[PDB]
Amino acid sequence: IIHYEILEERERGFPVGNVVTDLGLDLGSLSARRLRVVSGASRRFFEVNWETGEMFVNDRLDREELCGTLPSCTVTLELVVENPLELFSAEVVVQDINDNNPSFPTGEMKLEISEALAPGTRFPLESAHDPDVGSNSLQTYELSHNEYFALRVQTREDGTKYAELVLERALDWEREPSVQLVLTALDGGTPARSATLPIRITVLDANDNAPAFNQSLYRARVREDAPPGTRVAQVLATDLDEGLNGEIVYSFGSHNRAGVRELFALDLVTGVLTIKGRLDFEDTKLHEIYIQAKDKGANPEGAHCKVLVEVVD
C-alpha cells in the first residue's frame, strides 16, 4: 500500500506520485507491462503517464462531494501491470481547501415580537452551514450593531453552532415598530468566508398605553325644557396603541349617583352625552357626570373625565 496526499480540486494533470520511484517498476517496461489504473465503477480520478511513470489527477476531486463532513478523506485505487501480473494498492488523502462559503437556508428571517416581552428573552436564529471541514467550516456569527439585541453564539455537543438573539432593551412599537438586523456567518478560513442573513423584526403592539381625555372637565349648559335626544356634550379620549388596544369605549363611571343613567344617555362609541329624561331647574341646577374611557385591549386602564351640566331656567 502506497500513500499520497494532495489538496482537493487540483487541475487535470496534477502530479500525484511516480511508479518508478514508488512501486519500483522499470520505466522502459511500462508499455510492455501495460501499466494501468483500475478505477472500478468509480470515477477515473487518476491516470498514469507511460513515458514518465507519473500518476496524475484525471478528474475533479471535490472533497465535499467525496467525503462530506468526514474529518479525513481518502480515495483508493489500484494499479495493474502484466508480465507478470501484479496488482498494487494505493491511497490518496484528499485534503480540504476553503472553497465554500457558509450559507443560510433562506434569504431572510422574519420575526414577530411583542413589545411586551421582557429583556432577557432569547430567540434562536436560522443556522448557517459550511460544507468544508476543520477550520474551513463554520466558526462563528456576528450581529450588526443595534439598540435592542445582543448576540450569543452557542456550540452544540456535536460541535455545530447557532446564534441566539438576547433582548437587552425592551422593544417599543410606538417608537420603532420595525427593526432590521444583519446576521453574518463566518468560517474560520484565512481569509474568512462569510454569508449574511437579514433579520426583519416586526414589533407587535401591546396595550401599554391608557386612553387619555382631551380635557379633564367638560362644561355644558342645557335649558331645563330640553327634549330627549338633546345633545349635551361630546367627550373624546385618544389612545396611542393600535387596533383593539387603541379602540375606545365610553361609559358612565362608578363615581355617579343613582339617576344619572335615567336622566342622561351616553353613546359608548361616539362619546356623545344626551338628555334622556327630564331636567328640572328647581330640583337640580347642576349635574356632575363622571365618564370613563377604556380601550378594548388586555388589562385596560381607565381614563376619566367629568361633565358639568348646568341646567338653565
Q: Assess 37 for contact with a second copy (CB under 8 A).
A: no
Amino acid residing at 152: R
Q: Which stretch binds Cl ion (CB under 5 A): 10-18, 110-118, 141-149, 176-184?
A: 10-18
Site for Cl ion in 13-32 (CB under 5 A): 13
Question: Which residues does a chain break follow in the chain (C to N more than 2.5 Å)?
Answer: none
Rank residues 280 and 288 by Cβ distance to Ca ion and give the closer one: 280
Amino acid residing at 252: F
DSSP 296: S
Question: Number of residues in contact with a second copy, rule: CB under 8 A?
Answer: 39
Q: Please identify which residue in the block is written with the cell numbers 379620549.
A: 237
Cα separation, 80 vs 63, whole angstroms: 26
Q: Assess 210 for contact with a second copy (CB under 8 A).
A: yes
C-alpha 144: how far from chain center: 13
Q: Assess 12 for contact with Cl ion (CB under 5 A).
A: yes
Amino acid residing at 215: Q
Rank residues 26 and 86 by Cβ distance to a second copy and give the closer one: 86
Sign of CA dihedral 158, 163, 168, 169: negative
Site for a second copy in 243-282 (CB under 8 A): 253-259
Site for Ca ion in 20-39 (CB under 5 A): none
Among a second copy, Cl ion, Ca ion, none, the one that 124 touches (CB under a kind-dependent 5 to 8 A) is: a second copy
Interface pattern 149-178 for Ca ion (x via CB under 5 A):
-----------------------xxx----
Of 198, 204, 235, give the one whose Cα is nearest residue 218.
Answer: 235
Cα separation, 93 vs 89, whole angstroms: 13
Q: Determine which residue in the list 117, 192, 204, 265 makes contact with a second copy, applying CB under 8 A.
A: 117
Q: Determine which residue in the list 12, 34, 44, 122 makes contact with a second copy, applying CB under 8 A.
A: 122
CA 177 → CA 180, 209, 211, 242, distances in Å? 10, 15, 20, 11
Among a second copy, Ca ion, Cl ion, none, the one that 127 touches (CB under a kind-dependent 5 to 8 A) is: a second copy
Question: What's the grid cell of residue 246?
Answer: 387603541
Query: Could you tell me if residue 216 is left (phi over 0), alpha (psi between -120 and 50 degrees) or otherwise beta?
Result: alpha
Provide the binding-site residues for Ca ion, judged by CB under 5 A: 62-64, 96, 98-100, 115, 130, 132, 136, 172-174, 187, 193, 205-209, 239, 241, 245, 280-282, 295, 297, 313
Provide the binding-site residues for a second copy, judged by CB under 8 A: 40, 42, 65-70, 116-122, 124, 127, 131, 156-158, 160, 162, 167, 210, 253-259, 283, 298-299, 301-304
